[PDB]
Amino acid sequence: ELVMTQSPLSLPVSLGDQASISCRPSQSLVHSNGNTYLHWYLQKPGQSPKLLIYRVSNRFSGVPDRFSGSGSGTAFTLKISRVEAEDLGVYFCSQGTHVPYTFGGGTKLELKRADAAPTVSIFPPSSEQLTSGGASVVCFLNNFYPKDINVKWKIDGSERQNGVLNSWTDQDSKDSTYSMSSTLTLTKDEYERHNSYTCEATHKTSTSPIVKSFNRNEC
Amino acid sequence: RVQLLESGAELMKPGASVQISCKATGYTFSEYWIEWVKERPGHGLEWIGEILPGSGRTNYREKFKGKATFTADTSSNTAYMQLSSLTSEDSAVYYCTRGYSSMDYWGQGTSVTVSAAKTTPPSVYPLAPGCGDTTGSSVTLGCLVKGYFPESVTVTWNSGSLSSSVHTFPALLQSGLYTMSSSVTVPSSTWPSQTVTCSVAHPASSTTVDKKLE
Numbered sequence: 037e038l039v040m041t042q043s044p045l046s047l048p049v050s051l052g053d054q055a056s057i058s059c060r061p062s063q064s065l066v067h068s069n070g071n072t073y074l075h076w077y078l079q080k081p082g083q084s085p086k087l088l089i090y091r092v093s094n095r096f097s098g099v100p101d102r103f104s105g106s107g108s109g110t111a112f113t114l115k116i117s118r119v120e121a122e123d124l125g126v127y128f129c130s131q132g133t134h135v136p137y138t139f140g141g142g143t144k145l146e147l148k149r150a151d152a153a154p155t156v157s158i159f160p161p162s163s164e165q166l167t168s169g170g171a172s173v174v175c176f177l178n179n180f181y182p183k184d185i186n187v188k189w190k191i192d193g194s195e196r197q198n199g200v201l202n203s204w205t206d207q208d209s210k211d212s213t214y215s216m217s218s219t220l221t222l223t224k225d226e227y228e229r230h231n232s233y234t235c236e237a238t239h240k241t242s243t244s245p246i247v248k249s250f251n252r253n254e255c
Numbered sequence: 256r257v258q259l260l261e262s263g264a265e266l267m268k269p270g271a272s273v274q275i276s277c278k279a280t281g282y283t284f285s286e287y288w289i290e291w292v293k294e295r296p297g298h299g300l301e302w303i304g305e306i307l308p309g310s311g312r313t314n315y316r317e318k319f320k321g322k323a324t325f326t327a328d329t330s331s332n333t334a335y336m337q338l339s340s341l342t343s344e345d346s347a348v349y350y351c352t353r354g355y356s357s358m359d360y361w362g363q364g365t366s367v368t369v370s371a372a373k374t375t376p377p378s379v380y381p382l383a384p385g386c387g388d389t390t391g392s393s394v395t396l397g398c399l400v401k402g403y404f405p406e407s408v409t410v411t412w413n414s415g416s417l418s419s420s421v422h423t424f425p426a427l428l429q430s431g432l433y434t435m436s437s438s439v440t441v442p443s444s445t446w447p448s449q450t451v452t453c454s455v456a457h458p459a460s461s462t463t464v465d466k467k468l469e
């Protein structure tokens with residue numbers, strides 16, 4: 037079974053730079069007819085994949101000349117001479133020579149912008165929710181870079197947490213930053229017995245945590 | 256102008272069977288292969304098989320022999336794939352693509368969710384800042400869409416005017432139901448005078464709920 041092995045699995049580059057993706061099959065990809073059916077696909081986030089390059093180096097329709105393929109035998113590469121935000125997405129190499137046709141793992145491309153600190157904002161549960169016996173406290177850490185971030189929850193400064201959900205968005209093509217929501221889910225009862233609720237996030241853009249809290253008795 | 260159109264999202268109980276369509280237009284249907292690929296988050300893309308409308312000749316990846324069943328109606332220019340005895344491993348996004356020596360045109364994708372979980376509308380909750388919180392050129396607000404099933408909820412913001420800075424967070428599974436959130440950022444000059452509302456649609460229970468941010 038044809039195994040395609042791509043590297044890197046993650047490829048971060050600054051706009052205007054060059055990216056290079058490597059794909060290695062486990063057998064020769066030369067068909068009985070002499071042609072080598074190795075293709076490259078792109079899956080922009082939110083869409084179906086799309087043929088980018090066919091037969092190693094041929095650009096499909098609508099593919100700018102920045103993209104280019106080369107390769108022979110068991111070593112195939114894809115070069116993007118000058119990257120930009122629209123190139124954002126996942127790249128796949130594939131073989132259409134041997135049945136089953138197989139694909140690589142992909143290489144997600146991310147644009148390397150400058151670091152940006154999060155805009156942290158915290159919300160207390162809502163009267164409607166508090167009514168249903170539940171209580172979620174959410175914290176948005178919007179527009180930051182890099183993606184790496186740790187967020188700690190602290191009820192009364194003591195209880196650190198565990199009933200938390202973290203959700204990250206994908207790189208945002210306009211500004212290439214990320215955003216995440218951390219949600220601490222409690223019961224009305226549990227919530228009602230505490231006063232301070234803190235959201236603390238550590239990001240490399242700062243020596244100290246970005247703290248955001250709300251007290252139930254403030255005003 | 257080649258195009259493959261697929262049927263819509265499915266939620267099936269374990270042990271059931273589903274049939275997905277792929278209406279091809281813009282080329283001569285029977286001279287090209289219809290490929291079927293499976294995408295499951297984490298497993299990349301996995302080729303399932305292929306049929307040639309015309310001869311009705313099929314090629315199946317071994318693991319799918321007995322599981323997937325290709326069929327094609329040349330009268331209607333429609334390709335079909337049945338998936339028998341659904342299993343959780345069957346929950347993924349299935350694609351149909353056109354084929355000769357490449358898969359040059361792909362369909363939009365058909366999500367199949369195999370679960371025993373009943374369909375559930377979401378509970379939308381407004382999220383406004385608390386006392387002793389907000390100040391600044393802008394205010395961030397949000398809506399908490401919680402407890403729905405199956406997947407796919409669309410949340411729209413109908414703010415006064417100046418706004419956008421919208422963010423939608425991927426849904427997660429919590430106790431067997433999904434939960435997602437969306438945030439928007441409008442200038443304080445305008446809020447709370449100009450009204451901000453999030454509209455949340457969940458096509459599976461055919462429910463659309465609005466929630467004004469107070």
Ligand SMILES: N#Cc1ccc(N/C(=N\CC(=O)O)NC(c2ccccc2)c2ccccc2)cc1
Pocket residue numbers: 067069075130131132133137288290314354355356357358
């Ligand atoms: N990627 C990819 C890819 C997609 C589809 C195919 N299918 C495929 N047919 C399968 C078979 O006959 O059983 N393609 C064949 C083929 C095409 C048309 C009719 C018969 C055979 C082929 C392969 C390579 C070069 C010329 C023709 C091959 C590769």
